[PDB]
Motif scaffolding. Sequence first.
Motif, mmCIF file in Angstrom:
data_model
loop_
_atom_site.group_PDB
_atom_site.id
_atom_site.type_symbol
_atom_site.label_atom_id
_atom_site.label_comp_id
_atom_site.label_asym_id
_atom_site.label_seq_id
_atom_site.Cartn_x
_atom_site.Cartn_y
_atom_site.Cartn_z
ATOM 1 N N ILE A 128 0.975 -1.113 0.000
ATOM 2 C CA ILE A 128 0.000 0.000 0.000
ATOM 3 C C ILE A 128 1.022 1.167 0.000
ATOM 4 O O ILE A 128 1.748 1.332 0.962
ATOM 5 C CB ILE A 128 -0.884 -0.123 1.218
ATOM 6 C CG1 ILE A 128 -1.634 -1.475 1.183
ATOM 7 C CG2 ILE A 128 -1.876 1.021 1.276
ATOM 8 C CD1 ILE A 128 -2.441 -1.779 2.436
ATOM 9 N N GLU A 129 1.093 2.030 -1.010
ATOM 10 C CA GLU A 129 0.754 3.449 -0.944
ATOM 11 C C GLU A 129 0.413 4.094 0.409
ATOM 12 O O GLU A 129 -0.707 4.024 0.935
ATOM 13 C CB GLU A 129 -0.050 4.008 -2.125
ATOM 14 C CG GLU A 129 0.731 5.203 -2.741
ATOM 15 C CD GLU A 129 -0.124 6.196 -3.501
ATOM 16 O OE1 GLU A 129 -0.522 7.220 -2.895
ATOM 17 O OE2 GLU A 129 -0.380 5.957 -4.702
ATOM 18 N N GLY A 204 -6.746 1.954 0.688
ATOM 19 C CA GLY A 204 -5.391 1.724 0.171
ATOM 20 C C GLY A 204 -5.201 0.316 -0.365
ATOM 21 O O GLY A 204 -4.543 0.123 -1.387
#
Lengths: 613, 613
Positions: A128-129, A204
């Motif tokens: 995730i980002e 996310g």
Amino acid sequence: ATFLGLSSKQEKALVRLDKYLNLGEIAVSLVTDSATSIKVEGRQGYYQVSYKQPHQLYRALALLSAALRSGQDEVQIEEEAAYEDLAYMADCSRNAVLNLSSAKKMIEVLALMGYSTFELYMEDTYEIENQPYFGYFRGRYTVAELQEIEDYAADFDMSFVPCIQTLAHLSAFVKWGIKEVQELRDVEDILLIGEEKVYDLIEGMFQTMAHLHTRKINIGMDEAHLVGLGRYLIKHGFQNRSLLMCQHLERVLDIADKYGFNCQMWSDMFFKLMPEETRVYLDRLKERVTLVYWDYYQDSEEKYNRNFQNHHKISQDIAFAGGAWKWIGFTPHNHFSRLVAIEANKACRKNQVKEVIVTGWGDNGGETSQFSVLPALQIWAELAYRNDLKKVSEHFLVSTGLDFDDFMKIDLANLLPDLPDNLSGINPNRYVLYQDVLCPLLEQHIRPEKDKQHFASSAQQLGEISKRAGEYAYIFETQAQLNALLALKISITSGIQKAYRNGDKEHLSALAEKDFPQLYQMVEDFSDQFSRQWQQENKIFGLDTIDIRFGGLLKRIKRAQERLEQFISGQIDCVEELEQEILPFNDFYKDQGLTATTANQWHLIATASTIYT
Amino acid sequence: ATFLGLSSKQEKALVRLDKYLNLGEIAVSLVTDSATSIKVEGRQGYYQVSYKQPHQLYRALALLSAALRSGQDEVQIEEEAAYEDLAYMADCSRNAVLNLSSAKKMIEVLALMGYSTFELYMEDTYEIENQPYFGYFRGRYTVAELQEIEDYAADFDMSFVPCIQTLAHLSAFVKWGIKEVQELRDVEDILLIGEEKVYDLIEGMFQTMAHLHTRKINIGMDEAHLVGLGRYLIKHGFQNRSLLMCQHLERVLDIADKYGFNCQMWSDMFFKLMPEETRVYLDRLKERVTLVYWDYYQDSEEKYNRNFQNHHKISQDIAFAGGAWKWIGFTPHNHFSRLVAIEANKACRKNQVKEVIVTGWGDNGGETSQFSVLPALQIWAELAYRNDLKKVSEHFLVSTGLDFDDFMKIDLANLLPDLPDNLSGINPNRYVLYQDVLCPLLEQHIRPEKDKQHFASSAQQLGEISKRAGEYAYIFETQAQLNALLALKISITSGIQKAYRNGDKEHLSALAEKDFPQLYQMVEDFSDQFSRQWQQENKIFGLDTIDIRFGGLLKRIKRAQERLEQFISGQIDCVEELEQEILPFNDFYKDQGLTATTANQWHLIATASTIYT
């Protein structure tokens, strides 16, 4: 072989599968036909293959390959598959993250067996980002890696379904003592329902998965016992779990809808369906998901039927998940997997199930080979396509290049003579290995002569199999070494108790001078062999835990030798460890009257002392 | 020395203390006198010693011994102790069970320092009657062992107070998968309130302790967060924690009354005092116990005063428990213990406290020496009897036979230069040791040059101290080896990151060929030295966990060498471990702006992988 009717996509797949198929100098013509899942027909070097779903082409050619190998010229095969979707789900959360190359091998084998779908179970093992602690030092998949895996499956016209977690079972992530992570927690392994940063995290997860072509996802959502009883309770007072589950699930499905995903989840949450406004809540949420009935254990069709019936009271959209038993140590249980598959398949057919998922969990360190359950996987495929196992050996030889009965002996470390066939989880491969020598906590669950001789014989059998195992030799070598190691460990551990009880310091000297050095070396060698297996199959991350376990076992073997030597020499007047009365380890199978048992947590097997708390 | 006024009991004590006292050829006369705790008076070889409480005789003679050593002839000493009871509590539940011989040494030292009472913290480390899993393979004390310890203390007119647990913190017992144990559980480490088999267990605890002379006991009873939220919730629905605590406490006190015990407990449960019928419940229960205010951390008198004031709103019977910091790894923090003792003593005196307990907890494996906190113990004794530390060195020389300032350097592994003196728990001794080499999770909390040079210098200093340390040499040898080991581990761990970042395979070869073998050997040698320390002080049980931790560390050092060698040789194209971006480990001291931190759970330091779950 030469072909008429192939797409360029199918041509590239056949190039990848060339090493599996032995079609020889024949001509094959292809047809798409919905009348029947697979048809293979022909003689004298000319065959026609028809398939309903594109991926079924690869099972069709396996069937052809097998029939010709069996010496047939005239071929007439027709299969109607019971399930529109047949999936295998590998675990990549228990420390063993399948590497891309092994993922590609699995996909090829799955394609030949007839599976439509490949799934990976990832709690925290993808990126995730804006969540740098998610999958930190775990070997998490990058978006590019997941695309590569999805794209490889698509090359065989197979689907990909990520299996993730959106509430609980995130223990490797929530351990980080950083506010941005601790603020997401309810208690133990559970995320905080109602916390907006938790819904930021979940969004996310979907933004990562949205980079894939697939819009089918398993979101988990099983019901953990402590949901709402941690930081939630402190923030909001006590709430009914089902209501909290409804609130959380609705938020998750709203996020999934935004990104275009259709969600599957375990059915547990809805059992109560099978206060007025929570019932209404459940009823509207059930419409938005596919529910998966999971059962890995039951030995009779009727037990399954009873559950399918109860599920069908609330929904017709029920999938089934069964089990390829590879989550009980270093050694799988294909035999037990076969027994329950036979029965589960009967019940799935009776209850008009459309999707079956075979799960390959890896509980507590991911110590079993990722390819240890190929026999179980072929068994479910044969049952789905033929409803019998009459050709399981012929087809497996195409899938794997080796004999099904040989491969089934991979189980040997768990196959203690005279165990009842229908009891699950009995895992001496693991607990006989990890138990201490001076303080052997499972000693009363071991038959010192009978079990030792099983392991000794098993090591000889696997030794021969490994010599004719080809590209899978390494997994049988691991098992051969383990079985031999277990035989000697039992000999020494029981030998110490007896010789100490009887004051036989001479036999003790023999153990200390000869057998302990042998055992230590066998454990070092098994560690080396296991590391090869791991690195063939998985990312390097996760191996560190097994290093810790093996390293500890070695140090304790060393301690046992040293303690005995000091006793023999007279440096100490007794070995207090050897004076303790040993008790049963657990009573899990006390009602069945077994000596062996199930023990599947390393930290509880290895020592009675505190180690985590 | 010759004496007039001694009992036969005091004669036998003086024989036991002969090696500590250096009275020479003097004549001492004894008097009992309540006017003042201790008086020592005389000149020219004739002295009169007066004491209020019998055990104070032994501090009195220590004071005399010290004064004569200091070259005095004329002696005029008078002390009024602030606290009627001054206790030390050793932890025997974190894997380290004090052996009888070390228990006897501690008692003798305590007697000379002026302590009235010795306490042992035992969660599950004593025998019950009809509970064979209680203390199983933990080195639990037998009734005879506890009587021997109580009787030895009584020989110096000191009391004994068992510190046990009657609700929670029984994690080593409740792990057993036997129905007779699992039926006692609520959740995690907590017993099931309202379960009659739980009250059978608790009565068993008192029947064991009833074999002792003492009728004073600490029953624990702190408030765990999940009390009532496990099997209790499933059996009874949700209940207010305070009400459940009241119900359980009343049952426990009824059992204690039956056996004639008076109970102390931690005050936490009563904070809310500081629904109508639960308030009434608390108010009647508070009358039946002594409440102990525990605080190990606060750096100013006024913080303590505020809490004493709040406690005194509900009861005048409030004891204080402070801390001899020995629960943060292999190395204590006597310096920090001194800082808080100075302040706590001010507040205890202002608030008319009658009992102070100094606690010697051993969190997470009991890795610190049982005798590492003698300086802290002398400090509390000096503060209790004199209200200053002006004679701490003179008296400590009698207690221990060595120099106070030398002994205080036992702390060095935690004493990173320029740390603020008032922040607790900063424990690089432990986390620098246990962190991985390839995947060093605490690397950003380490100053590679500054910390390395501290440890290197510390090892030299402790090396010299060990040569003049007498019977305590072994503990300083352990610390000398650790400091030296830590210096090299930092050098290699930081060196690998830099050389790998810069592609310097030559420096990598140097590390792999020379420094790794050195490090491995230093760790093996430290393991050997630590094992000597352990066996001098504790029962053998519990050492197994440290064997597991050290064994794992060794295997991971071996792995680091092997991975680098394969990279150097070209067997692998990269070391993926060394490509990961390292993040902060925790943000515990982020607000204070520190680089170092507190990390006190081995399983979280050693690996990011799953190991217990």
